[PDB]
Write a protein that binds this ligand. Structure first.
Ligand SMILES: OC[C@@H]1[C@@H](O[C@@H]2O[C@H](CO)[C@@H](O)[C@H](O)[C@H]2O)[C@H](O)[C@@H](O)c2nccn21
Length: 358
């Protein structure tokens, strides 16, 4: 499209990830691996607003970015993830969150959005790009036989709509989560997905700040695979570029010339899964292609790092109420801590296995 949100801006580096990375690096014993690990803090990532507790820090990021831009002659861009739906993670347990549909969840979510909007409104000289609710709308394509997802459908749609409609009022550039090639990229899922995303876009008023979709968030697929990963058998869309090439024209035909961003933060190492659905702390992953607007596709505004490598996908402790057995598979690194918390050995492997090398 004409307007790529990243062009003309410097990305504000996540202080949250920088603090995790600095602490992680100083414990890595080899001087060279440690210096490579420390350098990860200079790679732009998305910072997740996975609870109301993260909102005050958003305010600090915006104010720090504003001052950094003034100090360096630049316009700054802050990258955030909106990730606090009620009944969050309807198809599994590892990422269940603080709000529930049964306890005023939609209303609580509105207030979460209102607090975020109130921060963003105070810093108009900082641009914000937001990924909207990973692992939400994609469940309403394929997972409606999951009763928790079926019962969450109206709330997910209403809450995502509230986020889109009200973040647009403060000029936030938005990419809605859209799963990955092995989820919505199956040919038969493309049209239902396009129909849903178009309905969501319509309900939110077709705002131009709603730029498009984010794919591969927290996943491990290639953008452009050298050869199909054997987990992809049966699906001609074996990587993210095939998925996006197939979905984007459907959105165009439906009236929305959407563009895309693609997570590659844990995509450096391919062919490390037994089943494509495997997702939890996949063993041996490496940091992938660095964020860039040189994407190789008309449809893709940026390669990005959305899931911050080193933060766990889920606990492997079967006593936890957030335990998903996907996290004890032979392709899951174990033992692993609760989703979102730091997993030091996994981070060190991501550094060691980075491709391209750090
Ligand atoms: O992608 C959204 C979440 C994600 O955890 C989420 O990661 C975020 C970034 O580290 C954290 O802020 C969250 O606390 C955590 O729940 C998992 O990494 C992924 O495997 C998954 N599967 C279902 C939900 N989720």
């Amino acid at each position: 499209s004409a307007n790529n949100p990243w062009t003309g801006f410097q990305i504000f580096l996540s202080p949250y990830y920088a603090n995790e990375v600095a602490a992680a690096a100083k414990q890595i014993t080899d001087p060279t691996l440690s210096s490579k690990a420390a350098s990860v803090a200079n790679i732009p990532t998305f910072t997740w607003l996975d609870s109301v507790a993260k909102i005050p820090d958003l305010g600090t990021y915006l104010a720090s970015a504003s001052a950094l831009g003034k100090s360096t002659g630049t316009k700054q861009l802050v990258q955030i993830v909106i990730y606090d739906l009620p009944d969050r993670d309807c198809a599994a347990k590892a990422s269940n969150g603080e709000f529930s549909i049964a306890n005023n969840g939609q209303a609580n979510y509105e207030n979460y959005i209102d607090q975020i909007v109130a921060q963003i409104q105070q810093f108009p000289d900082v641009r914000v790009v937001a990924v909207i609710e990973p692992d939400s709308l994609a469940n309403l394509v394929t997972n409606l036989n999951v009763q928790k997802c079926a019962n969450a459908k109206t709330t997910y749609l209403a809450s995502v709509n509230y986020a889109l409609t009200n973040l647009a009022k403060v000029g936030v550039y938005m990419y809605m989560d859209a799963g990955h090639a092995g989820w919505l990229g199956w040919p038969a899922n493309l049209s239902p997905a396009a129909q849903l995303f178009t309905q969501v876009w319509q309900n939110a008023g077709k705002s131009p700040f709603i730029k498009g979709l984010a794919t591969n968030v927290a996943n491990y697929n290639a953008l452009q695979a050298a050869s199909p990963d054997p987990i992809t058998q049966g699906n001609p869309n074996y990587d993210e570029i095939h998925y996006i090439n197939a979905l984007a024209p459907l959105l165009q035909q439906a009236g929305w010339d959407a563009t895309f961003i693609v997570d590659q933060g844990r995509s450096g190492v391919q062919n490390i899964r037994q089943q494509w659905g495997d997702w939890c702390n996949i063993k041996g992953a490496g940091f992938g292609t660095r964020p860039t607007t040189n994407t190789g596709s008309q449809f893709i505004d940026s390669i990005v790092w959305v899931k911050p490598g080193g933060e766990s996908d889920g606990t492997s402790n079967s006593s936890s109420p957030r335990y998903d057995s996907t996290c004890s598979l032979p392709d899951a690194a174990q033992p692993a801590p609760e989703a979102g918390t730091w997993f030091q050995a996994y981070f060190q492997t991501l550094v060691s296995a980075a491709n391209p090398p750090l």
